Amino acid sequence: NSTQMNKQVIDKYTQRHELYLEQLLNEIIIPAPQIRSALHYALFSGGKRIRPILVYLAGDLIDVDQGVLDIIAAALELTHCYSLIHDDLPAMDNDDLRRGKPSCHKAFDEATAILVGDGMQALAIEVLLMRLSPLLPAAQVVAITQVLVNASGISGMVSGQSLDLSELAKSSVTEEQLREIHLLKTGKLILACFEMVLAAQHEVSEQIKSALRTYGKHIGLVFQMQDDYLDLYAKTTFATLFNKQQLEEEIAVHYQIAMDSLRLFGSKAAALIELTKQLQNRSNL
Amino acid sequence: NSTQMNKQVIDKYTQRHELYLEQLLNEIIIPAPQIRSALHYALFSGGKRIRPILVYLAGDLIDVDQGVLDIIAAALELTHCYSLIHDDLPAMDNDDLRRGKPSCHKAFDEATAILVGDGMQALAIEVLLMRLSPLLPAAQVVAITQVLVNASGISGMVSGQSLDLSELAKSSVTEEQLREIHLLKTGKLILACFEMVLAAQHEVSEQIKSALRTYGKHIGLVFQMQDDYLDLYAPKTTFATLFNKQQLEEEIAVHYQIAMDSLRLFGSKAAALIELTKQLQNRSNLSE
Numbered sequence: 100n101s102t103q104m105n106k107q108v109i110d111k112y113t114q115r116h117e118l119y120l121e122q123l124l125n126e127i128i129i130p131a132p133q134i135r136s137a138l139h140y141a142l143f144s145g146g147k148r149i150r151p152i153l154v155y156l157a158g159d160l161i162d163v164d165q166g167v168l169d170i171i172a173a174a175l176e177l178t179h180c181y182s183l184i185h186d187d188l189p190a191m192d193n194d195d196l197r198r199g200k201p202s203c204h205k206a207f208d209e210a211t212a213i214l215v216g217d218g219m220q221a222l223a224i225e226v227l228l229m230r231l232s233p234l235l236p237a238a239q240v241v242a243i244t245q246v247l248v249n250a251s252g253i254s255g256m257v258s259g260q261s262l263d264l265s266e267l268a269k270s271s272v273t274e275e276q277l278r279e280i281h282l283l284k285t286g287k288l289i290l291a292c293f294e295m296v297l298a299a300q301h302e303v304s305e306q307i308k309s310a311l312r313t314y315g316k317h318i319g320l321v322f323q324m325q326d327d328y329l330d331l332y333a334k335t336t337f338a339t340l341f342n343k344q345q346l347e348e349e350i351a352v353h354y355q356i357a358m359d360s361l362r363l364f365g366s367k368a369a370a371l372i373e374l375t376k377q378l379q380n381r382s383n384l
Numbered sequence: 385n386s387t388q389m390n391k392q393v394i395d396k397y398t399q400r401h402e403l404y405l406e407q408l409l410n411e412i413i414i415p416a417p418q419i420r421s422a423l424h425y426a427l428f429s430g431g432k433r434i435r436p437i438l439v440y441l442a443g444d445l446i447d448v449d450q451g452v453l454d455i456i457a458a459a460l461e462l463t464h465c466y467s468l469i470h471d472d473l474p475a476m477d478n479d480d481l482r483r484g485k486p487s488c489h490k491a492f493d494e495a496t497a498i499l500v501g502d503g504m505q506a507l508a509i510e511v512l513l514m515r516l517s518p519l520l521p522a523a524q525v526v527a528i529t530q531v532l533v534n535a536s537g538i539s540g541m542v543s544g545q546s547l548d549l550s551e552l553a554k555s556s557v558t559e560e561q562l563r564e565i566h567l568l569k570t571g572k573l574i575l576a577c578f579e580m581v582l583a584a585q586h587e588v589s590e591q592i593k594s595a596l597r598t599y600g601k602h603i604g605l606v607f608q609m610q611d612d613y614l615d616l617y618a619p620k621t622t623f624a625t626l627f628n629k630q631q632l633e634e635e636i637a638v639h640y641q642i643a644m645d646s647l648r649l650f651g652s653k654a655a656a657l658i659e660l661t662k663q664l665q666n667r668s669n670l671s672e
Contacts, residue, residue, distance in 0.1 A: 130568055131543035133550060138538070185502060190494035209475035213498070214546050217470060217505065221537035224509055228530050237522035244529075245513050252506030253423070258416035261499050265418060283415055 105373035112155040113148055119169050120176070123226065137207045137215045138222075141184050142177070145198045150175045153292040153318075156371045157311055160364055163299045170230045171243065171295050174223040178251050179288060181219035182260070184212050191264060223247065235299065242298045250287040250294075259283025267335055274340050281323045289319035306363060313360040318375070321353040325382050333384065347382075354379045390659045394437060401436040401461070402428065404454045408511065418492070422500040426469055426488050427461070434664075435460045438577040438603075441657040442596060445650050448584045455515045456528065456580050459508040463536050464573065466504035467545070469497050476549060508532065520584065527583045535572035535579075544569025557621040566608045574604035591649065598646040603661070606639040610668050618671045633668075640665045 120142060129135040151172035158168040187194040187202040188209065194202050204212035227244045249255060262280045266272050293315040297303055327336035328346050337346055357375060361368040405427055414420040436457035443453040472479040472487040473494060479487050489497035509529060516525045534540060547565045551557055557565075578596040582588055612622040613632050627635055643661055647654040 128539045129543055130539070130564070131546040131550075134538050134543050134546050185498055188495075188498065190498060210549055211546065213470055213473065213475055214542050216502075217467075218538035218542035220502065220505055221533050221542070224529070224533045225537055228526055228533065232526060237526050240526050241513055241517060241522050245510070248506050248510045248513065252510055253419055253503035254413045254415070257499050257503035257506065258414060258419050261416040261418050261496065264495055265416075279415070 101369070102373065105370045108370045109152060109156075109374055112152055115165075115169075116148055116151040116155070116172050116176070117143075120173060123173055127222070133207065133211055134215060134218060137203060137211045138219060140206055141203050141215055141219070142180055144180075144183075144200065146176070146180065146183075148176060150179055150289070150292055152374065153289070154296060156374065157293050157296045158299075160311075160367055160371070161296065161300060161303060161307065163296060164234065167231070167234055167299055168296070170226060170234075171292075171299075174227050174247060175288065175292060175295070177219045177223035177226070178247060181216040181223070182251075182256060184216040184219075186260065188212060191260075220251070239298065243295045246291050246294045246298060250291040255283050255287040259285075259287075270335055272335050277335070277337070277340070278320070281320065285323060286316070286319040289322070290315045310360045310363045314357050317353045317357040317360075318378075321350060321357065322378075324349055324353065325378075328382055350379070350382055386655075387659075390656045393656050394432065394660055394663075397437050397440045398432045400454070401433065401440075401457055405458055405461070408458060412507070412510075418496055419500060419503060422488060422492050422496050423504070425491055426465055426500060426504075429483060429485070431483070433461055433464075434607075435464055435574070435577055437660065438574070439581060441660065442578050442581045443584075444656070445596075445647075445654060446581065446585060446588065446592065448581060449519065452516065452519055452584055453581075455511060455519075456584075459512045459532060460573070460577060460580070462504045462508035462511065463532060466501040466508070467536075467541060469501040469504070471545060473497060476545070505536070524583055524586075528580050531576050531579045531583060535576040540568055540572040541570075544572070552621055555621050555625075559626050562621060562623070562626065563605070566605065570608060571601065571604040574607070575600045595646050595649050599643050599657075602639045602643040602646070603664075606636060606643065607664070609636050609639065613668060636665075636668050 124135070124139060124142070129138075154172040154175060155165070155168050158165070158171075183197070184203045186192050187197060188204060195205055196202055200206065202212075203215065207215075224244060224247070227247070228240060231240045231243070251257070259280055259282070262276075263284050266276060266280060290312070293311040297308060297311065324337045324346060327338045328350065330336065331338040332343070337349070341349060354375065358372065361372055361375075364371075409420070409423060409427070414423070439457040439460060440450075440453055443450070443456070468482065469488045471477045472482055473489055480490055481487060485491075487497075488500065509532075512529045512532070513525065516528065520528075536542070544565060544567070548569050551561065551565065575597070578600040582593060582596065609623045609632065612624040613636060616622070616624040617629065623635070624632055640661065644658060647657060
């Protein structure tokens with residue numbers, strides 16, 4: 100009943116987000132029609148939009164304008180999707196397929212896949228700088244754009260993916276290195292949802308900052324724990340380092356920490372709690 | 385004296401730029417050894433890099449802080465370098481050699497080339513945001529970064545390179561289309577040198593703005609004319625297939641002449657840039 104109301108809040112965020120991306124793409128001057136077509140193809144591959152959903156939900160918690168959350172969600176989804184297209188390339192993960200359809204470089208060509216990835220990374224910065232300027236002071240525009248580029252660059256995602264491709268091949272890798280790799284590759288951009296939202300206000304409570312930072316950290320880690328779990332149950336991963344009921348144990352523990360950090364917000368977090376329960380339920384076998 | 389006073393000014397600007405890049409690179413947390421190794425391999429070479437110099441020389445003309453200039457020029461080279469690494473890949477221009485040495489994917493692998501390119505693009509923006517913020521008002525920081533990201537993205541460089549690959553294969557390309565493709569691919573980024581420099585000041589005069597913009601448009605165009613002139617004559621569709629030898633030679637000359645005359649508002653203050661322009665012109669003249 101209130102499960103029904105909460106799922107609809109999430110669904111309305113998803114549909115709002117996807118509509119906003121269409122409008123945004125249409126508003127950009129793109130002299131090469133192949134870039135426009137491949138961008139659309141890439142951006143609409145059936146992604147679950149978890150990074151936008153988190154931006155809206157965490158943004159609701161601290162009452163930022165949904166117009167602002169529209170910009171931030173778009174930026175992150177563009178960044179995330181650029182990385183997917185590049186990761187799919189033959190030189191990296193070499194994925195012929197993404198979900199149902201062929202992957203970007205198969206539906207178009209490799210050059211187009213590379214260039215589109217390059218363009219979406221830039222577009223995400225363009226979108227923040229041009230559309231956050233009328234809604235927010237310039238120092239706030241700088242601060243949140245900083246967060247994205249810190250997390251996505253050589254200090255984060257770029258190093259993390261490099262290490263994902265090189266290190267995981269051999270069996271010299273420790274749990275500590277695996278955790279570090281995943282924190283850089285996925286963990287930091289998941290964090291960036293919460294950091295970019297927090298950087299919309301001047302002075303947020305330190306208890307609120309810490310609660311969202313705890314949720315972000317532990318949700319980002321546990322997704323990967325869940326991914327490795329599912330991979331093997333439905334060379335070295337979380338499934339190699341932990342056994343069946345041990346990796347299961349880790350899943351529940353990190354979800355509980357994530358759940359507990361939201362107790363501060365009480366009623367206001369019921370939709371985020373509901374999302375967290377669905378995400379946890381992806382492994383309820 | 386003055387034929388070597390201004391010549392050494394150009395030499396000193398490369399040295400300053402390379403030294404600023406090293407310091408910058410050695411400060412960022414780069415958790416992957418492959419990344420910091422390939423970054424350093426790609427970013428440092430012999431000879432001079434034209435975009436940072438143009439930033440320095442245009443920045444001098446309107447007397448902006450040289451600390452600011454270091455940052456803008458670094459971000460520009462990082463953006464330029466990322467694009468070269470990506471264009472060098474087998475999916476695109478397929479270059480085994482960048483200049484004289486093996487390209488980034490040949491010295492390392494294609495994944496490292498893609499990723500380092502990806503990280504350089506992000507770094508250029510990081511450098512702009514963190515380093516300009518104690519020096520300039522936040523509004524200017526935003527507008528400076530806007531210029532680079534508009535010129536480098538899908539409305540500019542990315543469409544420019546996509547159309548360079550798909551359309552130039554055909555020989556049905558007009559002079560009009562060829563001029564548009566090169567403006568999107570390189571023209572806008574070269575123009576960004578002058579435009580990012582202009583966004584450092586609050587009340588720049590429109591006669592100054594227009595004088596830089598004219599130099600920028602004609603210089604970015606004529607480099608590509610020179611490139612097409614060079615690798616056909618001295619050592620598909622190009623400027624060298626659409627213009628003949630003598631026509632191209634005059635097109636080179638006229639566009640450089642327009643570029644020279646654009647700086648006469650500055651006068652003797654521009655003598656550094658004029659000598660560089662004449663140096664850039666004469667790598668087409670050495671055939672004659």
